[PDB]
Design a protein around this ligand. Structure first.
Ligand SMILES: COc1ccccc1-n1c(CSc2ncnc3[nH]cnc23)nc2cccc(Cl)c2c1=O
Length: 840
């Protein structure tokens, strides 16, 4: 139909890639998948409650932590309801529902509707004990009053959805390589390596002979693999590689229809930058012009008791106990396999067990499947996310293994889904096939809830715009989403996209106009001011959802407040008015637009920071981290939330002390005193400081991103410290002397506030260690799916030592309390060292 052709144009500009394009394809997986995703979408689109969907109450079922009970010191909670500009305060108990507040409010006003948060597309509707709304817990945490406007349900009709309706050795032939142009070196050596791979396990490996490197190289050979054909497991990849390692490509041996892949192939290959999730994609390089290729033939047909000695069970359990990064011995593996049934009784053994499987042997895979049908124990154990993540990583390519993980996720409530979304999305990179339990889990959840839907979009779009290796897959999932999210939401994404394409334009042009000489010359403030007033009228939408806080609808530029940093990269600092007239305040929405850093990295780190916070909640800690909004929009470009009322420790050192790397120790306290209206808010600032410092000291050590310059650390006027710019002699973390004179210490001393700081770290630290497995897998996934290129040992195995795996609680505290001492030891050594190696 005519309409649907133009609607596809829509989808394409929203997505930033064209999924009807079939230029870069050698089979029909993507298309089969676009058609596969229809059912599960229409399903959830058929399933959701239109009313609750439209208002998307952000809700939890977690208990309220202790640090916020000490804030309702009376089983009573105040709510300021507004009408036009008339208002009154209501007496409410934590457990009261949104329903049981209306019936009370109209028994509180004598001579149906819906409550909504002031200045936000946010609502308190539905049957949950209002102590269980996030916006409420946010007010408490930050000492705030809960303001609401009385309006109706947003018409549940506004999310109207548009309607739709055997026993031979495997053999492979290397014809040869081609590269149209390759003057890449004085010539060395070149051979081809064909690996049969399952879950990063090399099942089998044959090579070619070493020739010199010409723009055209031939062999015409059958490589005989040891594996029989009947023995290939679904999702095995034939993995093809060129060493002189220079190029790679991958072909799924078995297709999405369980068919043995037969025939002729010309595969355009990816280059290593002159281990890593890109190394894994089944996608061929779409740049058919410059790219190396390879030509192959496939002529080869679908797919076909309790007794235990003590010393073994002890060895078994010792193996099962150990961390996710401890290597399994061959003996270890045979132990797990032969006692697979005793192993099945322990959820925690699943990763190790399934990685003890000889996947290149058919009758064993078959035994593994028969095993997976005794899933009573797995099905009935509580949901361990770190367990579940492990089964979704690069080590498992089996469909059924992976499905039992996706099973466990189903019981996740939106609140938690949102905590893991980013990493669940990156985890699609490890799926063998475009259609998977996990890709479909993401749809479902995303379509069931607007908050997850929104983040689903930007997370998927972030990679679509930026990586060739996975743009196609993600673009099919993204497509599938947009076709379900409903008319309203499409409208928002549409104007969200237009605003950021516009503002990036401006970001790039401004960056071009200034030299290495960083000044912000009157001439550049000229350019910026003018560009924005031009944009303000006939181009820039009236208002837009702030991508990283979908509650906030942003309005007009505050042109006078927009500026540019005095820096080699030249980021915009942009500020916006709030489209919502019911907004309680008049404070601007701040967004930094920046080109230069890989913000994908920032996204990953930031989101672990939240996970960490949530981990701390489980033990009633609060460490006042400030994980500001950050989104990758495309290649080394993106946006960042402006944190209001903060500067850099560096600037606080430029102010009173000067600028040639000079350093003095009292200034932090001076600055803090001077930004506190009463010496009491000041107290609250020192207290903010001790807690926020401590948090970042711990988080930062665990992730090994703690050796930072002061210019990359910030504080709010209310004492909230926070690390920034996760761009990319040593020291564990940053506990400088200037920080210390706020603790009350002078190199040696130990004041009630310092004792406190040491207290809180140890508390925070060995609390992360209670979640060790989770953090290890997250970190390891982070590394593989979001960094430069990282070693299958040295890099990942940093976090083992940091979380001091294997150690008793006792050593652990001792270990951390000494890291502190290395800071106490060196003070300003490395800080100053930045400007030392300005010229060396
Ligand atoms: C208050 O902003 C600063 C104070 C001292 C040193 C640097 C900054 N700063 C910074 C500090 S980094 C930062 N990082 C994350 N969230 C933030 N909110 C406010 N600043 C940040 N970023 C800028 C980005 C674009 C344009 C400008 Cl003009 C700035 C900028 O001035």
């Amino acid at each position: 139909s005519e309409e649907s052709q133009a609607f596809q144009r829509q989808l394409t500009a929203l997505i930033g890639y064209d999924v009807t394009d079939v230029s870069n394809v050698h089979d029909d997986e993507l298309e089969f998948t676009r058609r596969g995703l229809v059912t599960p979408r229409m399903a959830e689109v058929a399933s959701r409650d239109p009313k609750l969907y439209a208002m998307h109450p952000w809700v939890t079922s977690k208990p309220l932590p202790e640090y916020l009970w000490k804030k309702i010191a009376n089983n009573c909670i105040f709510i300021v309801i507004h009408r036009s500009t008339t208002s009154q305060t209501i007496k409410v108990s934590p457990d009261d529902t949104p329903g049981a507040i209306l019936q009370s409010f109209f028994t509180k006003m004598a001579k149906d509707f819906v409550l909504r948060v002031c200045g936000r597309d946010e609502y308190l509707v539905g049957e949950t004990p209002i102590k269980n709304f996030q916006w409420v817990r946010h007010c408490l945490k930050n000492g705030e009053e809960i303001h609401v406007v009385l309006d109706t349900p947003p018409d549940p009709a506004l999310d109207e959805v548009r309607k739709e309706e055997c026993d031979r050795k495997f053999r492979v032939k290397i014809r040869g390589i081609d590269i149209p142009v390759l003057p890449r070196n004085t010539d060395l050596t070149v051979f081809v390596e064909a690996n049969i791979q399952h879950g990063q396990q090399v099942l089998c490996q044959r090579r070619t002979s070493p020739k010199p490197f010409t723009e055209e190289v031939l062999w015409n050979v059958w490589l005989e693999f040891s594996i029989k054909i009947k023995d290939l497991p679904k999702g095995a990849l034939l993995n093809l590689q060129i060493y002189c390692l220079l190029y790679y490509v991958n072909l799924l041996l078995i297709d999405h229809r369980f068919l043995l892949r037969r025939g002729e192939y010309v595969l355009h290959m990816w280059q290593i930058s002159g281990f890593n999730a890109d190394k894994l994609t089944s996608a061929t390089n779409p740049d058919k012009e410059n790219s190396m290729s390879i030509s192959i033939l496939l002529d080869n047909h679908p797919i076909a008791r309790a007794e235990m000695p003590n010393q073994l069970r002890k060895q078994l359990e010792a193996i099962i106990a150990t961390d996710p990064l401890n290597p399994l011995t061959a003996e270890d593996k045979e132990l797990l396999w032969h006692f697979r049934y005793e192993s099945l009784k322990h959820p925690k053994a699943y990763p190790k067990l399934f990685s003890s499987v000889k996947w290149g042997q058919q009758e064993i895979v078959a035994k593994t499947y028969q095993l997976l049908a005794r899933r009573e124990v797995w099905d009935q154990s509580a949901l361990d996310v770190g367990l579940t993540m492990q089964l979704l990583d690069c080590n498992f390519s089996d469909e059924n293994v992976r499905a039992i993980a996706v099973q466990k996720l189903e019981s996740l409530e939106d609140d938690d889904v949102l905590h893991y979304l980013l990493q669940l999305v990156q985890a699609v990179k490890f799926e063998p096939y475009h259609d998977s339990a996990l890709a479909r889990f993401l749809l479902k959840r995303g379509l069931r809830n607007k908050r997850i839907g929104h983040f689903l979009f930007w997370f998927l779009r972030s990679e679509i715009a930026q990586s060739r290796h996975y743009q196609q897959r993600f673009a099919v999932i993204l497509e599938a989403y947009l076709r379900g999210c409903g008319t309203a939401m499409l409208h928002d994404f549409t104007q969200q996209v237009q605003v950021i394409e516009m503002l990036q334009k401006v970001t790039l042009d401004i960056k071009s106009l200034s030299a290495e000489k960083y000044d912000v010359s009157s001439q550049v403030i000229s350019q910026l001011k003018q560009k924005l007033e031009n944009l303000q009228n006939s181009q820039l939408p009236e208002s837009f959802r702030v991508p990283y806080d979908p509650g906030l609808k942003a309005g007009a530029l505050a042109i006078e407040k927009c500026k540019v940093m005095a820096s080699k990269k030249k980021p915009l600092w942009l500020e916006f008015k709030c489209a919502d007239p019911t907004a309680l305040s008049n404070e601007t929405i701040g967004i930094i637009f920046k080109h230069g850093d890989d913000l994908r990295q920032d996204m990953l780190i930031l989101q672990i920071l939240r996970i960490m916070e949530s981990i701390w909640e489980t033990e009633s800690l609060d460490l006042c981290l400030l994980p500001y909004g950050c989104i990758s929009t495309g290649d080394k470009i993106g946006m960042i939330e402006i944190v209001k009322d903060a500067t850099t420790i560096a600037k606080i050192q430029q102010s009173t002390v000067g600028n040639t790397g000079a350093f003095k120790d009292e200034v932090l306290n001076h600055w803090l005193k001077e930004k506190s209206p009463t010496e009491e808010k000041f107290q609250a600032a020192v207290e903010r400081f001790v807690y926020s410092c401590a948090g970042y000291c711990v988080a930062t050590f665990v992730l090994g991103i703690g050796d930072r310059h002061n210019d990359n650390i910030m504080i709010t006027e209310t004492g909230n410290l926070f690390h920034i710019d996760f761009g990319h002699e040593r020291v564990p973390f940053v506990l400088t002397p200037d920080f210390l004179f706020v603790m009350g210490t002078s190199g040696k001393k130990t004041s009630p506030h310092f004792q406190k700081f040491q207290d809180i770290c140890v508390k925070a630290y060995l609390a992360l260690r209670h979640h060790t497995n989770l953090l290890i897998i997250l970190f390891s996934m982070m590394l593989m799916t979001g960094m430069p290129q990282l070693t299958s040992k040295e890099d990942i195995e940093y976090i083992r030592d940091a979380l001091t795996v294997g150690k008793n609680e006792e050593d652990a505290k001792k270990y951390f309390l000494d890291q502190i001492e290395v800071c106490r030891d060196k003070g300003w050594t490395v800080q100053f060292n930045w400007f030392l190696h300005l010229v060396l």
